[PDB]
């Protein structure tokens, strides 16, 4: 199960990342980077005392996943603005 | 192939639904009911400029959609609030 | 949809690449390399004023795709000879 | 699982067919018709030396094949020309 | 067909590898590493004069596969102890 | 989805079975027959400590299993020996 | 697979429902009338530890269901008594 | 009308047969064993005066049945129990 | 066995019923109503001693009958007239 | 359209006749005997203005019929008795 | 229960009768002629203590019957012959 | 065409057989046995000249017959008695 | 093979006979009356060399038949008229 | 309703047709042809006044008929002869 | 799913084709005869903008087809007129 | 033979019902509404004289039908239109 | 797909097996009795080189099978002779 | 009962027809060709006296068949061969 994602290029020294992230909580998330590389981990909050009579249908899997990536020599980041369940990341090379 | 979604209940009058829909603007999505039934339409803003050269990968198709539902006579909510590709509708019975 | 491909090794300092490329036009193609790495993009010519009565069956998808690859430190190329829809590339390390 | 192929018409006597078949020699492929019908056979040159050690990956199997077709009485073409894993047959009505 | 495998992390400078390898023979295996990187190849012994009346069912594919990996700069190994068809490798960074 | 396994015969009294089961301890697996039938159970040692944080990837689930077989009256083997996720049972007729 | 069904009437001011309900507990199914309709909901006791060896044969499957029923004018419900797998519920007009 | 059945094993001196048997009375069913097997005869109670008006739809046929089962060498029985339309028969070694 | 029956002329708010019933006695016929709606059953009196020689063949079946319909809300009835084996019944809604 | 018949016996000098005969007019039936047999002729009545709406269902058909009878040596006749739209007619043989 | 019949002819002053007639007692059958015909009355025997186990299958039914006959002018009778549980009875016409 | 037949009373180790067979000759019947088990076929003698006028209608089919059953191991037989078209056969196991 | 029959009436001293009777030879049919009835005997013709190819379909069968008749008191006869392969035969009663 | 019919003997190039048709008039029969091929329909003349008493039972259906076949190219016909209700028709191809 | 079909003939030099064609335009289907065969090809008008909300229900599907028909010797085509969904095309021999 | 139908909505004051209705005439169909619903009666034109020879195969049955549909509270109609065998009925709010 | 089957008995000490076996060689099938059961095993000759062009049509599939059969007490086997596709094997009790 | 068949081509002057034909004799089958096609008639040998006791189950129906096949312009035959229930017919150009 691979979550949809987006990636755009802007020129040879700039790239643009867009990530689809509807429904995830802040508490479900913790950061990281290891050896000039890049590590990606997802944890979705363990579900609450929410009555399944109240829960009618669950088509959205809200589970967990984990990715780790060597950053090709040598990419760098700049800021993170999050908006409307889509992820926008500015990248200062 | 079924859409991913989640649904929980809160109290006797209110429900919480989770569907993955990242990046949509309040103009890209619209709420509707008509005397017995109910329709859900996402009408995505005129898309911005899209270059399959810019697009490195398009895993998120973000275009319009349309869902439709019967209203039992005669239930009501309270307001519609939108956030992080997740939708909040207060429903008062 | 992954196009078939071939790869052979010759020894520890030589490798041999064979690519399957039947039907692609010169105008459908443009080159590249970014940051001592390697980028691969496919564009198939937008189809012509070709009458579909004349077109009997289309089993060959002739669409577009795009790949980008960091060259592991540090590979280099030598010439390109193209023959019979198969791709033969000599590689001078 | 159907083979990828394409077919276009040119004029009242001629057609253009596209099938993906890279690397074949005129001896690896042969054209045939016999009084009412028609057979297409690819008979691949005695393969060259193939070492699964050389082979890093074999996505292209390049061995013989056989296709067969009825001829309506009594149609004709003009010549058979082969190029870039694509086949050109001029057909004169 | 991807063989199951396992991987654990211990901290930022240590990793733990576990590989599932039931049924493979010593003679089916030969080692390697190319350009500060890592190459992985599998060869299962060509099957013996073993009578198929005696062979009742073959659900285990015992065939061959091949992987090659650049070691990200710059990982190193320490010893190999093999036990119960699972692979345990100590890794001295 | 069928389990991968292999089965060969040796002599008139003995058979060799190959199933992929890496890492199991003699306490994680148990042999059984009961007057006409036969049961095969893998009962995996109380698992050790498992942290989905430690777990980078879990492709091997190593928990208990249970298989069951009728014994024709009245066949016998000789001993049960376990090695490298492969099982050896000498069977004397 | 469409489920089988029974239902009787007793007179113009009464209806009699007769249902075949083998093996069920009172806690495994519950009645509710919710403004115009009567709903019969089945919820099966938390499974106890049951060894599948202890099960020699299970041809009998035991689950639940939920249906809501408009009371015909003007139906009323009265008691629920269960006997010989048959369940008796008076519905009164 | 013959009953569904289930078998089950319960422990080393016990097995469990489960049969689906709703609405049948103890007196309408009778036990007999004859020479190596076991014969079960059902004589279903005479219907009562039953007004087909009371029957909205009569899908259930209330008649008699008779089953016979070999007692495998050499099972012994303990007690025949019927409840909520499933019939449970324990088998002792 | 259904009686031949007729429904004829009366009014827009009147219906006229005709049933073919030659030879029937009041005592062989008996009336009975059970809420809104209405059901008619015929039981012909125990005759005087009648030899089957007297009744050569029953082509006419003189037994029991049953028929059932829904009333549009809320129709009513006016008189019952019998004539020439034909039944004239005015029904006023 | 000939009339459906039943017949009965009274005695050698007496006979009783039962016939389910809806409709008939004594003035629309006429008697005649001709040379050894007996002939009975039935008519109908002039159709009155009869609206086709008032006839809902004709189960009783009124048309024409034709039959002829003779006396065996040496037969004779008794009385004519009429009853419950059934006729009772004695002859004498 | 009336007896299944076959009949045969001998001659005008003679007749032979075959009837498959299991059971009957000459003393349980009695002759009488009444005014033009002939009447034959059959009885049965007092039921003895008869256990219902000994009767495995009644294919032969013994009940009561009733029949009446007459002589045409001018008929007469011959003899009564009895044979193989078949009766041979001559009259004379 | 099967003979009517009966099986009646004798003992717990005796069976009594009754077949309805009026009019059959010893010569029309013939016995034959072929190992353990046992098969009975009837061929009624070529009659004397018999006109089909003599046999008005065969309602009784006087031809050939065949019936086959398994003996519980190992039953036996005792005498054969014929009476009133009814057959009395004692069978002793 | 007996002939298919139809019959008609003319009058008490006259009768007309229609029978669909293909084949018959006046010389192959012979009349005889015997004691109260009338007997009509039909023959056929000597088979000529008749090739089986010329007979494509026999729908008309020619075999033998046998029938016997008597006069009631007191009957008589009229004429014999022959018509359209249909016979017209008057008697007189 | 198909006429019995026959096809008999004539030649290798001649066919002979026989239809069973006793009682039919030329006026009850009528010929008609519509290109190559050929279709025959029979309409029996309005008879003279004929009472259904005159025709006891129609076992013979004297109505209309229709039959259709393909001619091998290109057969022809020669004469039509009628005899003994049997039809003799020579057909010459 | 095999499509339904109609076809009529008119006489030996004519054929009449009758087809049920609801909702179709003349531009949506086209006739062509192409050397021995007649081909009826259907091509449906470019879809207009149609709101699926504007569609309450579509049980009626509207597409096209293509078939080529050998003219029987010696068929000819004549006009195409459409009415009440029925289409009439004369095919003449 | 009852017609396929489609529904459709057309705008806020309109809905569209589409019914497949080929070959039916306006005069053979009649409209009536009765107390909460709507009743549609089809009386399909009397077939014409139709030669089954003209019918090569007659799969279409030309008979009468009658449909009734509740007008949901409280739809109003505009005009009933039939074309090319589809019937379109617009519904106005 | 369940395979068809034949089997005959010859007498109480004999059984006769008859099987339809078209195209098979003696080497393609083999008999074996293995302690209580008789097993018939089919093994088809090594395929020869067969050109699929040389095959115009193959509606006949040729494989093998293996079944083991309990000899009924007390069956014995005797010879195997094959003729006209039928195979004859005596099984003797 | 008609036979499966296979076709096959064998070389440039040969084709192979393979038909499944078990148990049929040469004399029961006969060849004839008639004007453009080929007709094969099977007349299957008269069954022998066959004891249905010898038949444990008779799934095979031993009757006659007849096949006809057009010899495409213009195939010629060589020899008809039957073996082990498959029928092989070689076709020569």
Numbering used by the authors:
A (entry chain F), B (entry chain E), C (entry chain F), D (entry chain E), E (entry chain F), F (entry chain E), ...: 40 to 132
The authors write:
Aggregation Suppressing Protein A (AgsA), an sHSP from the pathogenic bacterium Salmonella enterica has been reported to form dynamic oligomers. In line with the current understanding of sHSP structure and function, our results show that in vivo, the wild type protein exists in an equilibrium between two oligomeric states: 18-mer and 24-mer.
Along with the wild type protein, we cloned different truncation constructs: AgsA:DelC lacking 9 residues at the C-terminus, double deletion AgsA:DD lacking 11 residues at the N-terminus and 9 residues at the C-terminus, and AgsA:His-DD, a hexa-histidine tagged double deletion construct. AgsA:DD formed symmetric 18-mers, an oligomeric assembly not reported previously. The application of the crystallographic 3-fold axis yields a closed 18-mer, with a dimer lying along each side of a trigonal bipyramid. The outer surface of the oligomer is charged, and its interior is hydrophobic. Though the IXI motifs in the C-termini of the 18-mer could not be defined for any monomer, the positioning of the monomers at inter-dimer interfaces indicates that the C-terminal regions are poised to form the hydrophobic interactions with the neighbouring β4–β8 clefts.
